[PDB]
Amino acid sequence: AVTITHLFGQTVIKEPPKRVVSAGYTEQDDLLAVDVVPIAVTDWFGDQPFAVWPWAAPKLGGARPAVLNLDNGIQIDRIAALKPDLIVAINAGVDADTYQQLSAIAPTVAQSGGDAFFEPWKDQARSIGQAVFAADRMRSLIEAVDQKFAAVAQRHPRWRGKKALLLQGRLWQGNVVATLAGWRTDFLNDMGLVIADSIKPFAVDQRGVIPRDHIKAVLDAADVLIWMTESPEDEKALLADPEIAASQATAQRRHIFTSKEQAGAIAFSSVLSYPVVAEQLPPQISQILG
Ligand SMILES: [Cl-]
Ligand SMILES: [Cl-]
Ligand SMILES: [Cl-]
């Protein structure tokens, strides 16, 4: 028997769960990675089959899990009717009230820390690994992710010190939104890249929010710009913006506009999704810096 400790206290899991609800946005990836097929998955975005993205889809096979959604909040009645022996909500934005409500249905694994959404991915992965008795296997999977990105650095020693920015694929009310240096950007550091500090003065929580008249100046501080774009229309809209259009990156073609899959892979930041980032992204960075 394993005992998981989290923000709301301890959860005792007597044996390996045969019925598992994934009540958060990204958890289905770590569960599938250790070959736990959830009976329910919670949709986030992308409108994927059964809310499982292409990298994890082969693991799903012919399984047809219920698809939940957080639009109105956690649907507990649906989770109750599914009658799970385990509920994983790390990423579901659980609070003290909703947790006890989930605990009534079955043992519930909540987030460990002050982040109700999107705690550091390794913490989420390790927690899931222990809960499903996959702990040794999960450790190997995490180590494999670090290996992949490190191998990119070794293959591209010239990239070291080059400045990059990781940006959302859409403007918010005319403003560029950058991912601040943190665990989310660690995969870029592993490749040897540095996050341009031009975004630091504009920091809000884990994101920089760039005023319009600061956009060109902030972008021009970077050698390569990675926009996480979910469709061709996202890219067109960004290139139509005069600040972005007049940036050095446009003239010098320093822009990387991700595919929906690539954006989703970054967004999920899982043991399954990150390997996709390590494969598909560096060839695009190579054409620019190279
Ligand atoms: Cl660590
Ligand atoms: Cl194991
Ligand atoms: Cl090689």
Please give the C-alpha separations between residue 219 and each of 24, 28, 117, 274, in angstroms, as whole numbers.
33, 35, 28, 25
Ligand with smallest separation from the Cα of 151: 3
Ligand number, closest to the Cα atom of 125: 1
Resolution in A: 2.2
Distance of CA 74 to the CA centre of its chain: 20
Distance in Å, CA 48 to ligand 3 centroid: 33
Give CA–CA dist 218/244, Å, rounded: 10
| CA 34 to ligand 2 center in whole angstroms | 8
**What dihedral angle (degrees, nearest 10) is formed by the CA atoms of 113, 44, 257, 196?**
-10
Determination approach:
X-ray
Distance from the CA of 94 to the center of ligand 3, in angstroms?
43
Q: 181 in helix, strand or coil? A: coil
Residue with tokens 């736990």: 36
Secondary-structure class of domain 134-290 per CATH = alpha beta
- Distance in Å, CA 274 to ligand 3 centroid: 18
Closest to 194 measured CA to CA, from 235, 166, 170, 233: 166
Do 225 and 241 meet the contact criterion of CB atoms below 8 Å apart?
no
Range(s) for CATH 3.40.50.1980 in the chain?
1-133, 134-290
156 alpha carbon – ligand 2 mean position (Å): 34
Q: Is 104 exposed, middle or buried (0-12, 13-18, 19+ CB in 10 A)?
A: exposed
Q: Calculate how far, in angstroms, residue 153's C-alpha sits from the geometric centre of ligand 3.
A: 11
Question: What distance in angstroms lies between residue 152's CA and the mean position of ligand 3's atoms?
Answer: 9
**Nearest listed ligand to the Cα of residue 145:** 1
Q: Superfamily for 1-133?
A: Nitrogenase molybdenum iron protein domain (3.40.50.1980)
Nearest ligand atom owner, CA of 139: 2
Instruction: For residue 200, report the distance from its CA to the centre of ligand 2, in Å.
Output: 41
